[PDB]
Amino acid sequence: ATQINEELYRLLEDTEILNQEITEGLLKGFEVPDAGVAIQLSKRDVVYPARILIIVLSEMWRFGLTKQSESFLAQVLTTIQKVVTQLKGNDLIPSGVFWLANVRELYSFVVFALNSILTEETMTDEEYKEYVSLVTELKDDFEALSYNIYNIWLKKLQKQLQKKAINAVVISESLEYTMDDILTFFNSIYWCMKSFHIENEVFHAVVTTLLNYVDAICFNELIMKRNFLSWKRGLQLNYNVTRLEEWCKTHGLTDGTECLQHLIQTAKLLQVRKYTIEDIDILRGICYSLTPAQLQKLISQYQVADYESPIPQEILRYVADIVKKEAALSSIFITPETGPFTDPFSLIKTRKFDQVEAYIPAWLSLPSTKRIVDLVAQQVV
């Protein structure tokens, strides 16, 4: 163990090689596995980079190479953030989820280390105060990374939806994108998180955030449409929105209906009858998530068909004066939730750290890192 520990020390201390292997080879030559079923990934295949970084970090601390560890981890933090900010296209969903899972594994370890240092009795009491202050300042930074890469990734997903969602929900006519394309997008998110063993609460967060986004942006599209909002349309809007409601209930979400109420109640407004005062009274009850201002505009921009007579003046006049008297007892658009976002990982308990076996994919080429991982393994008999 003398010569093993010496070779190991020499690898760990010389961080300008080791950083360049990790930065390029592992954090940029990162091959994210496929995000589909019939190819069960284990946890180690999803969190392989994090677990390498832990083996290396555990050893740097064992040997007391603490200034090497902060140069090492400062390069990691920068590189994981750069990778996620540069994501685009087909890989946005799977790459995003891959890194969220790996940062979570890292963060969970640092938390486990910090709690162990404070509780276990291990060396002087000034080197200890600085070791605690090093590991807590580290925890704070990996907390900040989790938060950043989630908000970057989630803002990127909202921008992919915005291109598809307006045309698919508001324009598309399933009796230029379709509702099939929106469902395929949500299927992609569902299967990634399933295949990558993401905690079920993070899925709920992501889909809730995006359904409220679709709700807001499509409602704000609808309410400006001029010769458009007919009875025909409301039926078609109801059918489109129901596809998402029904998807949510077959993929484990019970909040899906709460998230789509501005769309649902707009569809109801266009299908219910509006030619007496009592009809406006129970309409106001049906459309509980709509303000009087929003009702006024949707009603006055309602496209009657041929045959169908227009909304009487009595009615248009009555709605006009419900708005005037609420202002009294003192924007029609819904402001969409673009950010910032609570990190759903922060709300849930960090992953427990039993000693995990030292694995490195055979397709990688990191000779210094491989040898570090090998020499740790050797001392496990």
PDB file of C-alpha atoms in Angstrom, residues 131-324:
ATOM      1  CA  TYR A 131     -11.854  22.105   5.970  1.00  0.00           C
ATOM      2  CA  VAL A 132     -15.465  22.602   7.118  1.00  0.00           C
ATOM      3  CA  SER A 133     -15.442  26.030   5.447  1.00  0.00           C
ATOM      4  CA  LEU A 134     -14.032  24.494   2.238  1.00  0.00           C
ATOM      5  CA  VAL A 135     -16.654  21.709   2.074  1.00  0.00           C
ATOM      6  CA  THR A 136     -19.605  24.043   2.980  1.00  0.00           C
ATOM      7  CA  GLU A 137     -18.530  26.626   0.366  1.00  0.00           C
ATOM      8  CA  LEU A 138     -18.439  23.670  -2.065  1.00  0.00           C
ATOM      9  CA  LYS A 139     -21.958  22.516  -1.140  1.00  0.00           C
ATOM     10  CA  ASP A 140     -23.239  26.080  -1.709  1.00  0.00           C
ATOM     11  CA  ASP A 141     -21.749  26.076  -5.241  1.00  0.00           C
ATOM     12  CA  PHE A 142     -23.204  22.666  -6.253  1.00  0.00           C
ATOM     13  CA  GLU A 143     -26.546  23.855  -4.908  1.00  0.00           C
ATOM     14  CA  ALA A 144     -26.209  26.925  -7.155  1.00  0.00           C
ATOM     15  CA  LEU A 145     -25.325  24.713 -10.150  1.00  0.00           C
ATOM     16  CA  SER A 146     -28.383  22.465  -9.658  1.00  0.00           C
ATOM     17  CA  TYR A 147     -30.537  25.595  -9.613  1.00  0.00           C
ATOM     18  CA  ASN A 148     -28.831  27.142 -12.677  1.00  0.00           C
ATOM     19  CA  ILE A 149     -28.784  24.106 -14.992  1.00  0.00           C
ATOM     20  CA  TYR A 150     -32.471  23.396 -14.171  1.00  0.00           C
ATOM     21  CA  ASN A 151     -33.591  26.970 -15.008  1.00  0.00           C
ATOM     22  CA  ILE A 152     -31.413  27.054 -18.169  1.00  0.00           C
ATOM     23  CA  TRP A 153     -32.766  23.682 -19.309  1.00  0.00           C
ATOM     24  CA  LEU A 154     -36.388  24.488 -18.438  1.00  0.00           C
ATOM     25  CA  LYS A 155     -36.290  27.871 -20.228  1.00  0.00           C
ATOM     26  CA  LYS A 156     -34.857  26.020 -23.234  1.00  0.00           C
ATOM     27  CA  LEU A 157     -37.803  23.524 -23.160  1.00  0.00           C
ATOM     28  CA  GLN A 158     -40.369  26.328 -22.935  1.00  0.00           C
ATOM     29  CA  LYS A 159     -38.864  27.784 -26.144  1.00  0.00           C
ATOM     30  CA  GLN A 160     -39.158  24.459 -28.003  1.00  0.00           C
ATOM     31  CA  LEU A 161     -42.851  24.196 -26.969  1.00  0.00           C
ATOM     32  CA  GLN A 162     -43.714  27.800 -27.946  1.00  0.00           C
ATOM     33  CA  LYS A 163     -42.911  27.007 -31.610  1.00  0.00           C
ATOM     34  CA  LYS A 164     -45.201  23.936 -31.622  1.00  0.00           C
ATOM     35  CA  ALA A 165     -47.829  24.680 -28.955  1.00  0.00           C
ATOM     36  CA  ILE A 166     -49.648  27.710 -30.373  1.00  0.00           C
ATOM     37  CA  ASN A 167     -50.335  26.151 -33.798  1.00  0.00           C
ATOM     38  CA  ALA A 168     -51.023  22.659 -32.368  1.00  0.00           C
ATOM     39  CA  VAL A 169     -53.559  23.778 -29.710  1.00  0.00           C
ATOM     40  CA  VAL A 170     -55.184  26.909 -31.194  1.00  0.00           C
ATOM     41  CA  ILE A 171     -55.013  26.442 -35.006  1.00  0.00           C
ATOM     42  CA  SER A 172     -54.755  22.659 -35.595  1.00  0.00           C
ATOM     43  CA  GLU A 173     -57.939  20.831 -36.534  1.00  0.00           C
ATOM     44  CA  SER A 174     -57.929  17.093 -35.736  1.00  0.00           C
ATOM     45  CA  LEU A 175     -61.587  16.682 -36.814  1.00  0.00           C
ATOM     46  CA  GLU A 176     -47.164  23.824 -38.922  1.00  0.00           C
ATOM     47  CA  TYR A 177     -47.671  21.418 -35.987  1.00  0.00           C
ATOM     48  CA  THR A 178     -50.330  19.027 -34.579  1.00  0.00           C
ATOM     49  CA  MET A 179     -51.412  17.749 -31.153  1.00  0.00           C
ATOM     50  CA  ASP A 180     -49.519  14.522 -32.022  1.00  0.00           C
ATOM     51  CA  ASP A 181     -46.304  16.577 -32.030  1.00  0.00           C
ATOM     52  CA  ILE A 182     -47.055  18.090 -28.598  1.00  0.00           C
ATOM     53  CA  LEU A 183     -47.823  14.625 -27.156  1.00  0.00           C
ATOM     54  CA  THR A 184     -44.591  13.258 -28.705  1.00  0.00           C
ATOM     55  CA  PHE A 185     -42.701  16.065 -26.974  1.00  0.00           C
ATOM     56  CA  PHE A 186     -44.223  15.164 -23.594  1.00  0.00           C
ATOM     57  CA  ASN A 187     -43.637  11.426 -24.272  1.00  0.00           C
ATOM     58  CA  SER A 188     -39.987  12.238 -24.804  1.00  0.00           C
ATOM     59  CA  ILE A 189     -39.754  13.954 -21.407  1.00  0.00           C
ATOM     60  CA  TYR A 190     -41.648  11.117 -19.667  1.00  0.00           C
ATOM     61  CA  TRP A 191     -39.441   8.319 -21.091  1.00  0.00           C
ATOM     62  CA  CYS A 192     -36.108  10.161 -20.433  1.00  0.00           C
ATOM     63  CA  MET A 193     -36.856  10.637 -16.785  1.00  0.00           C
ATOM     64  CA  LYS A 194     -38.071   7.035 -16.538  1.00  0.00           C
ATOM     65  CA  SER A 195     -34.981   5.591 -18.305  1.00  0.00           C
ATOM     66  CA  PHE A 196     -32.552   7.856 -16.361  1.00  0.00           C
ATOM     67  CA  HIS A 197     -34.069   7.004 -12.927  1.00  0.00           C
ATOM     68  CA  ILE A 198     -35.066  10.614 -12.170  1.00  0.00           C
ATOM     69  CA  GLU A 199     -37.146  11.026  -9.015  1.00  0.00           C
ATOM     70  CA  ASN A 200     -40.871  11.143  -9.744  1.00  0.00           C
ATOM     71  CA  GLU A 201     -41.390  14.599  -8.170  1.00  0.00           C
ATOM     72  CA  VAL A 202     -39.087  16.277 -10.723  1.00  0.00           C
ATOM     73  CA  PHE A 203     -41.218  14.960 -13.603  1.00  0.00           C
ATOM     74  CA  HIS A 204     -44.344  16.422 -11.923  1.00  0.00           C
ATOM     75  CA  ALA A 205     -42.562  19.793 -11.618  1.00  0.00           C
ATOM     76  CA  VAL A 206     -41.366  19.875 -15.219  1.00  0.00           C
ATOM     77  CA  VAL A 207     -44.750  18.921 -16.739  1.00  0.00           C
ATOM     78  CA  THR A 208     -46.733  21.235 -14.399  1.00  0.00           C
ATOM     79  CA  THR A 209     -44.490  24.167 -15.376  1.00  0.00           C
ATOM     80  CA  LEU A 210     -44.854  23.420 -19.113  1.00  0.00           C
ATOM     81  CA  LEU A 211     -48.658  22.834 -19.043  1.00  0.00           C
ATOM     82  CA  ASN A 212     -49.142  26.206 -17.288  1.00  0.00           C
ATOM     83  CA  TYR A 213     -46.859  27.676 -19.984  1.00  0.00           C
ATOM     84  CA  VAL A 214     -48.996  26.184 -22.794  1.00  0.00           C
ATOM     85  CA  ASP A 215     -52.140  27.362 -20.936  1.00  0.00           C
ATOM     86  CA  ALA A 216     -50.878  30.949 -20.822  1.00  0.00           C
ATOM     87  CA  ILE A 217     -49.354  31.360 -24.290  1.00  0.00           C
ATOM     88  CA  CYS A 218     -52.279  29.714 -26.123  1.00  0.00           C
ATOM     89  CA  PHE A 219     -54.869  31.703 -24.129  1.00  0.00           C
ATOM     90  CA  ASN A 220     -53.020  34.907 -25.024  1.00  0.00           C
ATOM     91  CA  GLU A 221     -53.079  33.799 -28.677  1.00  0.00           C
ATOM     92  CA  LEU A 222     -56.836  32.971 -28.555  1.00  0.00           C
ATOM     93  CA  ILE A 223     -58.069  36.220 -27.016  1.00  0.00           C
ATOM     94  CA  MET A 224     -56.528  38.369 -29.836  1.00  0.00           C
ATOM     95  CA  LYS A 225     -58.023  36.251 -32.690  1.00  0.00           C
ATOM     96  CA  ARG A 226     -60.597  38.386 -34.508  1.00  0.00           C
ATOM     97  CA  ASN A 227     -62.898  36.425 -36.864  1.00  0.00           C
ATOM     98  CA  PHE A 228     -62.155  33.103 -35.299  1.00  0.00           C
ATOM     99  CA  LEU A 229     -63.678  32.162 -31.923  1.00  0.00           C
ATOM    100  CA  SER A 230     -66.792  30.344 -33.184  1.00  0.00           C
ATOM    101  CA  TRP A 231     -68.818  27.538 -31.644  1.00  0.00           C
ATOM    102  CA  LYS A 232     -66.980  25.242 -34.145  1.00  0.00           C
ATOM    103  CA  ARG A 233     -63.645  26.440 -32.754  1.00  0.00           C
ATOM    104  CA  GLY A 234     -64.570  25.891 -29.072  1.00  0.00           C
ATOM    105  CA  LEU A 235     -65.438  22.276 -29.861  1.00  0.00           C
ATOM    106  CA  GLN A 236     -62.122  21.866 -31.688  1.00  0.00           C
ATOM    107  CA  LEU A 237     -60.215  23.597 -28.864  1.00  0.00           C
ATOM    108  CA  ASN A 238     -61.932  21.336 -26.331  1.00  0.00           C
ATOM    109  CA  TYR A 239     -60.853  18.249 -28.322  1.00  0.00           C
ATOM    110  CA  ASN A 240     -57.218  19.421 -28.593  1.00  0.00           C
ATOM    111  CA  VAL A 241     -56.957  20.317 -24.888  1.00  0.00           C
ATOM    112  CA  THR A 242     -58.637  17.025 -23.879  1.00  0.00           C
ATOM    113  CA  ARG A 243     -55.714  15.163 -25.569  1.00  0.00           C
ATOM    114  CA  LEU A 244     -53.368  16.670 -22.922  1.00  0.00           C
ATOM    115  CA  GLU A 245     -55.821  16.069 -20.042  1.00  0.00           C
ATOM    116  CA  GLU A 246     -56.075  12.435 -21.104  1.00  0.00           C
ATOM    117  CA  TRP A 247     -52.298  12.090 -21.599  1.00  0.00           C
ATOM    118  CA  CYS A 248     -51.652  13.408 -18.071  1.00  0.00           C
ATOM    119  CA  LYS A 249     -53.987  10.866 -16.432  1.00  0.00           C
ATOM    120  CA  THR A 250     -52.313   7.930 -18.338  1.00  0.00           C
ATOM    121  CA  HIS A 251     -48.786   9.128 -17.346  1.00  0.00           C
ATOM    122  CA  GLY A 252     -49.306   9.530 -13.572  1.00  0.00           C
ATOM    123  CA  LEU A 253     -50.270  13.224 -13.309  1.00  0.00           C
ATOM    124  CA  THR A 254     -53.451  14.186 -11.462  1.00  0.00           C
ATOM    125  CA  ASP A 255     -52.816  17.976 -11.627  1.00  0.00           C
ATOM    126  CA  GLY A 256     -53.081  18.145 -15.469  1.00  0.00           C
ATOM    127  CA  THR A 257     -56.632  19.547 -15.406  1.00  0.00           C
ATOM    128  CA  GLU A 258     -55.747  22.309 -12.872  1.00  0.00           C
ATOM    129  CA  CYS A 259     -52.973  23.444 -15.270  1.00  0.00           C
ATOM    130  CA  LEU A 260     -55.215  23.878 -18.385  1.00  0.00           C
ATOM    131  CA  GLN A 261     -58.236  25.766 -16.949  1.00  0.00           C
ATOM    132  CA  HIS A 262     -57.926  28.989 -18.969  1.00  0.00           C
ATOM    133  CA  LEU A 263     -58.033  26.857 -22.154  1.00  0.00           C
ATOM    134  CA  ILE A 264     -60.816  24.552 -20.841  1.00  0.00           C
ATOM    135  CA  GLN A 265     -63.093  27.427 -19.697  1.00  0.00           C
ATOM    136  CA  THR A 266     -62.527  29.372 -22.947  1.00  0.00           C
ATOM    137  CA  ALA A 267     -63.754  26.262 -24.793  1.00  0.00           C
ATOM    138  CA  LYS A 268     -66.791  26.134 -22.465  1.00  0.00           C
ATOM    139  CA  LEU A 269     -67.495  29.860 -23.038  1.00  0.00           C
ATOM    140  CA  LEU A 270     -67.639  29.264 -26.800  1.00  0.00           C
ATOM    141  CA  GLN A 271     -69.938  26.185 -26.446  1.00  0.00           C
ATOM    142  CA  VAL A 272     -72.487  27.443 -23.830  1.00  0.00           C
ATOM    143  CA  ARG A 273     -75.429  29.712 -24.692  1.00  0.00           C
ATOM    144  CA  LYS A 274     -75.124  33.476 -24.105  1.00  0.00           C
ATOM    145  CA  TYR A 275     -78.462  35.174 -24.976  1.00  0.00           C
ATOM    146  CA  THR A 276     -79.935  35.939 -21.533  1.00  0.00           C
ATOM    147  CA  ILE A 277     -78.713  37.423 -18.225  1.00  0.00           C
ATOM    148  CA  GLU A 278     -79.134  34.111 -16.334  1.00  0.00           C
ATOM    149  CA  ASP A 279     -76.925  32.483 -18.999  1.00  0.00           C
ATOM    150  CA  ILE A 280     -74.173  35.063 -18.288  1.00  0.00           C
ATOM    151  CA  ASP A 281     -74.587  34.467 -14.508  1.00  0.00           C
ATOM    152  CA  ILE A 282     -73.958  30.673 -14.651  1.00  0.00           C
ATOM    153  CA  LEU A 283     -71.322  31.288 -17.392  1.00  0.00           C
ATOM    154  CA  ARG A 284     -69.417  33.470 -14.896  1.00  0.00           C
ATOM    155  CA  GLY A 285     -69.614  30.485 -12.504  1.00  0.00           C
ATOM    156  CA  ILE A 286     -68.354  27.993 -15.138  1.00  0.00           C
ATOM    157  CA  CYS A 287     -65.484  30.301 -16.116  1.00  0.00           C
ATOM    158  CA  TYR A 288     -64.211  30.747 -12.539  1.00  0.00           C
ATOM    159  CA  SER A 289     -60.577  31.271 -13.676  1.00  0.00           C
ATOM    160  CA  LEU A 290     -61.643  34.050 -16.088  1.00  0.00           C
ATOM    161  CA  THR A 291     -61.957  37.672 -14.960  1.00  0.00           C
ATOM    162  CA  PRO A 292     -64.794  39.932 -16.197  1.00  0.00           C
ATOM    163  CA  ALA A 293     -62.344  41.773 -18.540  1.00  0.00           C
ATOM    164  CA  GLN A 294     -61.382  38.458 -20.189  1.00  0.00           C
ATOM    165  CA  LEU A 295     -65.059  37.411 -20.552  1.00  0.00           C
ATOM    166  CA  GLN A 296     -65.920  40.773 -22.097  1.00  0.00           C
ATOM    167  CA  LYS A 297     -63.336  40.413 -24.887  1.00  0.00           C
ATOM    168  CA  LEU A 298     -64.012  36.720 -25.606  1.00  0.00           C
ATOM    169  CA  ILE A 299     -67.782  37.395 -25.737  1.00  0.00           C
ATOM    170  CA  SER A 300     -67.519  40.490 -27.976  1.00  0.00           C
ATOM    171  CA  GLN A 301     -65.063  38.693 -30.324  1.00  0.00           C
ATOM    172  CA  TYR A 302     -67.314  35.588 -30.533  1.00  0.00           C
ATOM    173  CA  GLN A 303     -67.880  34.631 -34.176  1.00  0.00           C
ATOM    174  CA  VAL A 304     -71.543  33.726 -34.730  1.00  0.00           C
ATOM    175  CA  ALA A 305     -72.198  31.483 -37.736  1.00  0.00           C
ATOM    176  CA  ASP A 306     -74.707  32.219 -40.508  1.00  0.00           C
ATOM    177  CA  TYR A 307     -78.160  31.144 -39.095  1.00  0.00           C
ATOM    178  CA  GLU A 308     -76.968  31.918 -35.515  1.00  0.00           C
ATOM    179  CA  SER A 309     -78.177  35.364 -34.434  1.00  0.00           C
ATOM    180  CA  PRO A 310     -75.706  37.806 -32.808  1.00  0.00           C
ATOM    181  CA  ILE A 311     -75.345  38.333 -29.042  1.00  0.00           C
ATOM    182  CA  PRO A 312     -78.125  40.772 -27.976  1.00  0.00           C
ATOM    183  CA  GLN A 313     -77.266  44.302 -26.808  1.00  0.00           C
ATOM    184  CA  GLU A 314     -78.813  43.662 -23.381  1.00  0.00           C
ATOM    185  CA  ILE A 315     -76.097  40.986 -22.956  1.00  0.00           C
ATOM    186  CA  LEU A 316     -73.108  42.925 -24.379  1.00  0.00           C
ATOM    187  CA  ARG A 317     -74.210  45.926 -22.277  1.00  0.00           C
ATOM    188  CA  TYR A 318     -74.613  43.760 -19.141  1.00  0.00           C
ATOM    189  CA  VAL A 319     -71.078  42.257 -19.404  1.00  0.00           C
ATOM    190  CA  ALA A 320     -69.608  45.718 -20.125  1.00  0.00           C
ATOM    191  CA  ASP A 321     -70.955  47.041 -16.780  1.00  0.00           C
ATOM    192  CA  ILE A 322     -69.782  44.036 -14.700  1.00  0.00           C
ATOM    193  CA  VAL A 323     -66.221  45.036 -15.719  1.00  0.00           C
ATOM    194  CA  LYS A 324     -66.784  48.759 -15.025  1.00  0.00           C
TER     195      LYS A 324
END
